[PDB]
Design a protein around this ligand. Structure first.
Ligand SMILES: [Mg+2]
Ligand SMILES: [Mg+2]
Ligand SMILES: [Mg+2]
Ligand SMILES: [Mg+2]
Ligand SMILES: [Mg+2]
Ligand SMILES: [Mg+2]
Ligand SMILES: [Mg+2]
Ligand SMILES: [Mg+2]
Ligand SMILES: [Mg+2]
Ligand SMILES: [Mg+2]
Ligand SMILES: [Mg+2]
Ligand SMILES: [Mg+2]
Ligand SMILES: [Mg+2]
Ligand SMILES: [Mg+2]
Ligand SMILES: [Mg+2]
Ligand SMILES: [Mg+2]
Ligand SMILES: [Mg+2]
Ligand SMILES: [Mg+2]
Ligand SMILES: [Mg+2]
Ligand SMILES: [Mg+2]
Ligand SMILES: [Mg+2]
Ligand SMILES: [Mg+2]
Ligand SMILES: [Mg+2]
Ligand SMILES: [Mg+2]
Ligand SMILES: [Mg+2]
Ligand SMILES: [Mg+2]
Lengths: 165, 48, 174, 288, 186, 318, 269
RNA sequence: GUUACAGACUUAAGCAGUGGAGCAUGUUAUUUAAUUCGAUAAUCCACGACUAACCUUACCAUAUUUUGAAUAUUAUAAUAAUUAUAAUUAUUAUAUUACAGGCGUUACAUUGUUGUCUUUAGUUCGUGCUGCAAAGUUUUAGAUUAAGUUCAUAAACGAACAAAACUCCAUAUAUAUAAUUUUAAUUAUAUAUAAUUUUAUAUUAUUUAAUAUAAAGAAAGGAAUUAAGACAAAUCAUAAUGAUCCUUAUAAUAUGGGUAAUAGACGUGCUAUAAUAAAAUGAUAAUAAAAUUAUAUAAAAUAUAUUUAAUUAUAUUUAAUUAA
């Protein structure tokens, strides 16, 4: 039995709730910023850490949270406050998301192959193989450096031993 | 599943104030105690 | 809950007899006592044809029946080309054959789903409904013939333990 | 219906006035407004939603889905009592119900309904006594089905006495209640000389039991089988001698003795009337 | 009874209004999936209502066909395989389609929808962007600056009269404003 | 004829007369048959979410029992949680039971536990859950004053707390108490009254429509359509399930010290048929297509010295 | 202010109930990290006249929580009979649904009209200038791997090409170009993000256009349009190409307008 | 190892099969280092097992692990997060016992669940009444229904778990929605209404009930639900738990083998034994439904088998869509 306190809707209140994939350029930047904040482990989806609780300031977002292979139990690392908090905000990620920049690998030229192997037909075959690999690896999603390494291995520019590390 | 999930161990870490009781564990302990009492406890493990 | 059928029948008898009193001689009191115990049309289109949708099994047949000289077109092709079995054609004809109006009505059938015999049956069903609009007095006759009844016969599902709907796997007493 | 701003302000609060104005601007005057049959967005009663209800809307400080508050702020720090109690009238009692020695009172009330008997009398003046308290069973296809059998003399201690038996598959308390009920239904005025003993030396057979009950001089107590004694205590007999022969089946004793009292006895006055004679009591005349 | 119930209340009580479609430029379609109806239909109705307030011509809950994921199982834990039980799961699907809206309004709508979402209902959005054939991401810094200005215009506090505010959104805006963010590309 | 057409167009009301619908106070949402109220387009993710939810339930159960310096062990009974997965946020919720103005000045163990769920600024349980789901979580406890309003709680409580009353055999007093929870409500009468009330409401709305009326199907203003219809009158009468009509509780297993064999012991009260569906427009519906809506069945299986046993409970709710 | 519980020094002049509420808040917020205060104690003592508790007793309770209460001082009342003052589980669920409905009605009434402030008229990009349609998809609550999928789609006649170049473009497209509807579309899922994929698609389109406009020692005038994929697709689908014969129509047999006199009388406007 | 009736896929017709043949699969027996364990009358035998190469697996041979998967107790030390070079916490490491673990044994210790009697019509409780009483009546004269199902008659009157009904699928109609390019509007899906159908004329038996006829209707099925008790029916190999036994072994990991062995026997199937029946062919591609496709569905097209090509099978390479 009381009056309805009408808090007015605003674009700012509906920020965060904006679609992660929306055509607009303005929206893309915002989405990127949100992603960067999430990566930093900003209090989104949760109440913030301020200078009130001192001991129990725990977090679960450690370097390998929901993962098995790193041998540990649940690690309650202390969170920073809202002050003294850094944001990652990397350039490569920005390039990927905001603009539509992609690496595409590099096609291996015939000259490089000639450096190692002698015969011409064999070199041409190796080049063809490398080309075949390239398109497949572009299609697949793995990781910038790892994918490149794999591509090199497939080509024969690097040996098999470099994978097993 | 997600291996990092909250357990009873943590429910002491997060909330020390509340003296929780894990019932299944307590039951197991009681059973062990009973076994010890009536000469049906586990034999001592070999080391070598 | 204590009301019995016999009691109800008696009550009805009592009311009916009272009601039967010649309306001119009836009283106000009697009528007051009895007071307690009381209590879309299809047409042709712009172009003068009667649309009707019939169904059987999985089949559905939307059929445009029109007053022009009796020719058939099933699903955008000739009747003998579509329905190879003469039985299906005979079935289709039957609504026009119970009436003396095969040759009177042009029919443009459009079927979908099911197999051929079921499709033909659905078309027939649709045609009967279409005919009913042209002359409502024949509706009873069509119903009697057994064309206005939607044939419900629906394929029974395979039940778990059974092989087919009813076909069970062999029993073994020993 | 497009109302003026001042009128709206008079009936509606200052927060929603702007929203109302906006709604008026957006939605035209010429509007059809269809009735959505296949889905109902709004409630089945009229309500201007300006006032938040205590029970029928969400509690403001409490957390839930559709909270519309921050993760920190939830004004609800005591969970001992219930958060949203029932609106208007506190109860949800149906029509014709009420909220919750007592057993005896309930019995008396039930008797008053069924047979017009005075409840207050039943509660106070009548006092009961169990005579037999069997557990009893029937061999059913399900199995052996046990049943608690009671047999309970009730009696105002002024010659008004009744026997009653009762039975329940559920525990013996219910069986005893039933026996008590039966006893009060079967209350019976026994005749007795000087309000203390039977008139003559009676000798009565009820089925197996052969009863013999002698009258007694005043002061000489109840000197009889325990069932008989129990019945006499309730029925107001102070003085009695007697002995049971043949069967001594407790139930049949209890049934037989009340029958003997009601039937085998003749009051002196009745005898006098029948015979047409004076029938004096010599002791009374003497004055002891 | 001398109690003026204004038009918004009336609209709530009746079925939801729909604005007409000027041009068939399907901007976005929103599919709503759920494992039941009652919540889903309500949610769709709410979406329609909010879409009305905005200029956009949302069509309406076109029911796409329900799925049926069946699974059979022997009832017993051991043998009795002649007795078997079925199980089913119906993915109920409804379609909304927005027809004429400047992207920002559409975004706002979608954001509003996801804010006050209901329990059982999942959602998917297909947005459509009618772009020209030839494009250029060369004249970059100026275009970034323009985008930032547009964002600032969008998220400006007109009158702080106890309006709805978000901390994360404010932070995002601050980040967008910063010199470091401007630097990123070059 | 026009007036009749207009009425037909607008003819809707709460179901339950003899143009009507089951309102949200007259039946359960089928979403409230399942415990993980979710749809996701990627089914792997949905599966992962429901696993998480199940794991959280166990954690909550574990939390629910407290200790007070090894003096008192107050076992708060909780229902099975129901997890509401909106696009924005999860909301976990459960019903719970706990067994002069002196306690305004110290926090009870139960109170502390409840505070932990949402109120501890950084430290709270909801915050920690949010990491597993990647969305804001809200745990809402709901207190039940009686043991027998929720079926799960009733069964659970009997399994955990009242061991001594049935371990040898069901004590007589305890059995009597179980029998006489409710006051033997004439369920037929209540259902009939409810139906009559619904009819009266329908008549009232119809009467109002007639009064308004004295190609477009718009009637008068809202105030005049819903003339006598208010929050005070209608909602509580329309509210479907309110009255525990009948209930059955079964104890089963090795609940006999002398005997080696098992013992099925059943307590039955009232009725499990509903007479609101028998003679009216409102129809019965089936939860997971096999449990009559009004019913709610549950069991909970505590281990004894002798071995395993369980306690089925089944309530009717008119 | 909101941050009031944190400062126990400030609240002595408040009413007793308010003080109690603040105390409860303080206890809640720092559950395990609670540490008693003198000012807070004094406030609690001052409040004591509100709820009937003596001054020593309140202090004792403050010092020792539940243990103190126990020292100051029960029967099991689990199956105590129903006093008709609390709804069951199903009932409570129905109530909650009704609360939700009411909330949504309120939102519709007073927040959606507010939302109409943020309203813009449609600013149409013309089909002549903007023929291509990059459709993006987004799954709201989930993180689907199809959110990266972007689909370009254009009518080939709407592209700025000469006739020879258009044919060459169509030939290059192969399966991507449908011929019944003059539409060429293609989707990319190769890259991590949606924007990347869109950019890649755009680059492909540009490359295709460049190839079409070359004509230097490569015309493709004498390679007919391969329409096998389209006919296969058509076969897979069904067709309803047939129509009612136009010469079978009978406008004369159609139902004529029946004269309604009362309706005519009514129509005075 | 009894009486009397009534019932249906019980029997009788009828249609197609099994029993003969070969193969598949399960079982038995025997074999084997191991052929893992259970199910084994109806109520086992393509059953547990909706796929045994490795895995799964539990079995066997040979190797090698010994606080091991947990929880708690007690100590040393190292790294990372947080704060304003110290400290608080969280973890890890090495140990330290209680133990952990056990598809080991007993469903004749249990749970839950299931099979059969069983969609069979039974199973009980109040208040009253009868009998000294255990008990009986209610819950049945006689009939009827699919039916403790309605009639009727009756010391009974009500009430419960079953039955029926509400439920789901399918059907008919109406309304709503779908800018009829996600179209199939001949549709899909929410919400209703509809029937356990109604009415009347007659002909037999006693106001009704079966047959027939007629006029009114789209009006005709399937699924789920299988009570109480019983069978110490099945399951400790889904899982859990009691008791009991193993603890450098009955626990744990790898490499291979086995579960696929074959005299006879037993079920279930598959393919057959040719002309009321088999094979080639049939591109303005004769006519379906239901369901699956981000641990993917793979179109067109090229190449080889194959002198044309089609067919069928692979390879080449991924167009389209994560889906009316
Ligand atoms: Mg008697
Ligand atoms: Mg036969
Ligand atoms: Mg043979
Ligand atoms: Mg054979
Ligand atoms: Mg075997
Ligand atoms: Mg066995
Ligand atoms: Mg079989
Ligand atoms: Mg192995
Ligand atoms: Mg083993
Ligand atoms: Mg053990
Ligand atoms: Mg069992
Ligand atoms: Mg019988
Ligand atoms: Mg009997
Ligand atoms: Mg179409
Ligand atoms: Mg049934
Ligand atoms: Mg049974
Ligand atoms: Mg057994
Ligand atoms: Mg056995
Ligand atoms: Mg065991
Ligand atoms: Mg075994
Ligand atoms: Mg096990
Ligand atoms: Mg071993
Ligand atoms: Mg085998
Ligand atoms: Mg042949
Ligand atoms: Mg063909
Ligand atoms: Mg192909």
């Amino acid at each position: 039995s009381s009056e309805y306190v009408l808090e007015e809707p605003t674009p700012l209140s509906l920020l965060e709730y904006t679609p992660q994939v929306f055509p607009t350029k303005e929206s893309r930047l915002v989405n990127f910023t949100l992603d960067s904040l999430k990566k930093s482990n900003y209090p989104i989806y949760r109440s913030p850490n301020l200078g009130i609780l001192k001991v129990h300031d725990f977090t679960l977002n450690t370097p390998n949270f929901g993962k098995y292979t790193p041998g540990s139990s649940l690690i309650f690392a202390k969170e920073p406050q809202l002050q003294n908090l850094l944001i990652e905000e990397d350039p490569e990620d920005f390039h990927r998301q905001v603009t539509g920049e992609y690496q595409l690998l590099k096609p291996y030229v015939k000259k490089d192959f000639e450096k190692l192997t002698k015969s011409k037909d064999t070199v041409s075959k190796l080049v063809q193989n490398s080309q075949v690999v390239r398109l497949s690896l572009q299609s697949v999603v793995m990781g910038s450096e790892e994918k490149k390494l794999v591509y090199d291995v497939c080509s024969g520019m690097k040996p098999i031993s470099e994978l097993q590390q | 599943g997600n291996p990092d999930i909250l357990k009873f161990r943590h429910l002491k870490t997060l909330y020390p104030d509340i003296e929780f009781v894990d019932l299944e564990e307590q039951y197991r302990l009681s059973m062990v105690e009973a076994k010890k009492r009536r000469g049906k406890g586990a034999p001592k493990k070999m080391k070598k | 809950t204590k009301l019995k059928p016999t009691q109800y029948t008696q009550l009805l008898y009592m009311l009916n007899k009272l009601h039967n009193i010649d309306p001119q001689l009836t009283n106000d009191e009697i009528t007051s006592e009895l007071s307690q115990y009381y209590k879309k049309i299809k047409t042709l289109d712009e172009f003068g044809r009667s649309i009707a949708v019939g169904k059987r099994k999985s089949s559905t047949a939307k059929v445009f029946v029109v007053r022009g000289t009796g020719e058939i077109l099933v699903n955008g092709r000739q009747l003998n080309d579509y329905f190879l079995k003469m039985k299906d054609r005979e079935s289709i004809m039957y609504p026009l054959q119970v009436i003396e109006s095969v040759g009177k009505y042009n029919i443009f059938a459009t079927t979908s789903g099911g197999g051929p015999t079921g499709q033909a049956e659905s078309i027939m069903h649709a045609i009967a409904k279409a005919l009913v609009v042209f002359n409502p007095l024949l509706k009873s006759r069509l119903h009697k013939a057994g064309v206005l009844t939607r044939d419900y016969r629906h394929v029974e599902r395979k039940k778990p333990g059974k092989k087919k709907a009813r076909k069970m796997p062999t029993w073994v007493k020993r | 219906q497009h109302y003026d701003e001042s009128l709206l302000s008079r009936y509606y609060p200052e927060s929603l006035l702007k929203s109302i104005k906006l709604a008026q601007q957006t939605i035209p005057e010429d509007t059809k407004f269809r009735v959505s049959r296949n889905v109902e967005f709004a409630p089945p009663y009229l309500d201007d939603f300006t006032k938040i209800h205590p029970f029928w809307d969400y509690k403001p400080g409490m957390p839930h889905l559709h909270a519309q508050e921050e993760n920190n702020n939830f004004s609800i720090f005591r969970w001992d009592q219930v958060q949203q109690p029932l609106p208007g009238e506190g109860n949800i009692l149906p029509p014709g119900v009420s909220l919750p020695k007592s057993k005896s009172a309930d019995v008396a009330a039930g008797l008053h309904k069924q047979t017009g008997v005075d409840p207050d009398y039943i509660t106070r003046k009548l006092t009961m006594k169990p005579l037999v308290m069997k557990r009893v069973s029937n061999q059913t296809g399900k199995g052996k089905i046990a049943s608690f059998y009671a047999l309970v003399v009730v009696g105002d201690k002024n010659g008004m006495v009744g026997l009653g038996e009762g039975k329940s598959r559920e525990e013996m308390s219910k069986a005893i209640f039933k026996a008590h009920w039966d006893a009060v239904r079967n209350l019976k005025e026994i005749p007795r000389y000087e309000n203390r003993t039977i008139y003559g030396d009676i000798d009565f057979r009820y089925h197996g039991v052969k009863l013999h009950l002698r009258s007694a001089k005043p002061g000489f107590g109840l000197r009889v089988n325990h069932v008989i004694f129990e019945i006499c205590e309730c029925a107001g007999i102070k003085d009695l001698s007697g002995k049971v022969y043949k069967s001594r089946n407790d139930m049949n004793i209890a049934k037989g003795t009340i029958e003997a009292f009601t039937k085998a006895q003749k009051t002196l006055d009745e005898v006098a009337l029948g015979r047409g004679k004076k029938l004096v009591d010599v002791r009374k005349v003497y004055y002891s | 009874s001398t109690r003026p119930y204004p038009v918004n209340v009336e609209a709530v009580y009746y079925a939801p209004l729909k604005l007409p479609i000027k041009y068939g430029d399907l901007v976005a379609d929103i599919q709503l999936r759920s494992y039941d109806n009652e919540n889903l239909d309500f949610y769709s109705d709410f979406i329609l209502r909010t879409g009305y307030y905005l200029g956009i011509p949302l069509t309406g809950p076109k029911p796409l066909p329900t799925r049926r994921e069946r699974w059979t199982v022997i009832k017993s834990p051991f043998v009795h395989a002649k007795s078997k039980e079925n199980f089913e799961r119906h993915t109920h699907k409804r379609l909304i389609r927005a027809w004429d809206t400047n992207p920002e309004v559409l975004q706002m709508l979608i954001a509003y929808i996801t804010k006050h979402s209901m329990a059982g209902v999942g959602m998917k959005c297909n947005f459509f962007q009618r772009s020209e054939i030839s494009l250029d991401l060369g004249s970059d810094a100026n275009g970034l600056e323009k985008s930032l200005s547009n964002i600032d215009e969008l998220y400006s506090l007109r009158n702080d009269d106890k309006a709805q505010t978000s901390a994360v959104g404010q932070k995002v805006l601050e980040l967008l404003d910063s010199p470091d963010f401007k630097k990123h590309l070059e | 004829n026009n007036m009749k057409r207009m009425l037909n167009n607008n003819n809707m009301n709460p179901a339950g007369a003899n143009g009507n619908i089951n309102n949200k106070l007259q039946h359960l949402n089928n979403m409230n048959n399942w415990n993980t109220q979710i749809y996701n387009y990627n089914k792997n993710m949905e599966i992962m979410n429901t696993m998480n939810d199940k794991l959280i339930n166990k954690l909550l159960y574990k939390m629910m029992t407290l200790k007070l310096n090894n003096m008192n062990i107050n076992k708060i009974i909780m229902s099975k949680t129901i997890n509401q997965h909106s696009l924005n946020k999860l909301n976990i919720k459960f019903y719970y039971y706990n067994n002069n103005n002196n306690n305004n000045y110290y926090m009870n163990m139960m109170n502390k536990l409840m505070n932990i769920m949402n109120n501890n600024m950084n430290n709270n349980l909801c915050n920690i859950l949010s990491y597993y789901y990647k969305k804001k979580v809200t745990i809402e406890p709901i207190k039940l004053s009686y043991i027998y309003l929720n079926s799960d709680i009733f069964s659970k409580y009997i399994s955990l707390n009242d061991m001594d009353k049935y371990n040898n055999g069901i004590l007589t007093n305890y059995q009597r108490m179980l029998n006489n929870i409710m006051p033997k409500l004439n369920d037929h009468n209540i259902s009939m009254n409810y139906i009559n009330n619904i009819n009266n409401i329908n008549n009232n709305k119809y009467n109002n429509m007639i009064n308004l009326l004295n190609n477009n199907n718009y009637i008068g203003n809202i105030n005049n359509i819903y003339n006598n219809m208010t929050i005070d009158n209608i909602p509580m009468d329309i509210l479907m399930y309110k009255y525990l009509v009948g209930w059955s509780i079964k104890f089963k297993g090795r609940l006999s010290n002398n005997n080696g064999r098992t013992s099925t012991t059943n307590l039955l009260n009232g009725t499990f048929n509903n007479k609101k569906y028998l003679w009216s427009n409102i129809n019965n519906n089936y939860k997971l297509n096999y449990i009559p809506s009004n019913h709610n069945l549950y069991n909970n299986s505590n281990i004894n010295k002798n071995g395993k046993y369980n306690i089925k409970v089944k309530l009717n709710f008119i | 202010s909101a941050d009031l519980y944190m400062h126990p020094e400030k609240w002595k002049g408040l009413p007793p109930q308010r003080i109690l509420e603040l105390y409860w808040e303080r206890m809640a917020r720092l559950g395990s990290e609670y540490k008693p205060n003198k000012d807070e104690l004094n406030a609690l003592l001052t409040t004591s006249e509100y709820s009937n508790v003596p001054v020593n007793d309140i202090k004792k309770l403050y010092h020792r929580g539940e243990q103190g209460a126990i020292d100051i001082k029960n029967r099991d009342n689990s199956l105590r009979p129903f006093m008709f003052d609390e709804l069951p589980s199903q009932a409570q669920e129905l109530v909650a649904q009704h609360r939700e409905q009411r909330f949504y009605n309120r939102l519709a009434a007073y927040e959606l009209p507010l939302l109409a402030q943020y309203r813009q008229e449609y600013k149409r990009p013309s089909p002549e200038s903007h023929p291509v349609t990059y459709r993006y998809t987004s799954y709201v609550g989930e993180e689907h791997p199809n959110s990266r999928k972007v689909v370009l789609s254009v009518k080939t006649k709407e592209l700025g090409l000469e006739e020879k170049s258009l044919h060459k473009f169509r030939i290059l497209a192969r399966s991507r170009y449908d011929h019944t509807t003059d539409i060429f579309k293609m989707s990319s899922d190769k890259f991590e993000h949606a924007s990347q994929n869109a950019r890649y698609l755009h680059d492909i389109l540009q490359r295709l256009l460049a190839e079409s406009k070359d004509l230097t020692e490569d015309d493709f005038s004498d390679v007919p349009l391969d329409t096998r994929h389209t006919i296969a697709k058509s076969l897979r689908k069904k067709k309803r190409d047939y129509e009612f014969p136009e010469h079978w129509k009978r406008p004369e047999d159609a139902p004529k307008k029946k004269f309604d006199i009362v309706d005519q009388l009514l129509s005075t406007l």
